[PDB]
């Protein structure tokens, strides 16, 4: 298992895409799966090394195109909304 | 006399705001309605339909 990078994981038939990180969520022996308000998984227990992993969906956001009219130029600027200048 | 009444009237506004939270209800309700509407949208993902 690879951590801190967007990966496509499969835990015991549970599939999804997200970033797996170490977590400080204190699970209990009868429970393996954490859960979100919207019923999506939020933490898994590693089936072989029992540490709890956080699942964060890979970074995303809207992309806007800022342009003068094509009656003036064909040059445009791109705004990546609510994202740093690293994931571009 | 008029200037002193004005200065005291402004001072009372500060005392009113600093203690009564309900004074801003017209703006808090707008914030609450949008957050309440958005949370309902999120909860709908948990339904089977």
């Amino acid at each position: 298992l690879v951590k801190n990078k967007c990966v496509n994981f499969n835990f015991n038939g549970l599939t999804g895409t997200g970033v797996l990180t170490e977590s400080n969520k204190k699970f209990l022996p009868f429970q393996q799966f954490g859960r979100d308000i919207a019923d999506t998984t939020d933490a898994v227990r590693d089936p072989q090394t029992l540490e709890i992993l956080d699942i964060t969906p890979c970074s995303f956001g809207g992309v806007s195109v800022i342009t003068p009219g094509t009656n003036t130029s064909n040059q445009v600027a791109v705004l990546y909304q609510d994202v740093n200048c690293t994931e571009v | 006399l008029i200037a002193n009444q004005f200065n005291s009237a402004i001072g009372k506004i500060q005392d009113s705001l600093s203690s009564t939270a309900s004074a801003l209800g017209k703006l808090q309700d707008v914030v609450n309605q949008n957050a309440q509407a958005l949370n309902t949208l999120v909860k709908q993902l948990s339904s089977n339909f």
Partner: peptide
């Protein structure tokens, strides 16, 4: 006066500092 599912909030064009200046 006081997420991961495609729901975002856009920032207002007039920042609060500009509102006070007006």
């Amino acid at each position: 006066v006081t997420k991961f599912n495609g729901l975002t909030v856009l920032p207002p064009l007039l920042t609060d500092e500009m509102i006070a200046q007006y």
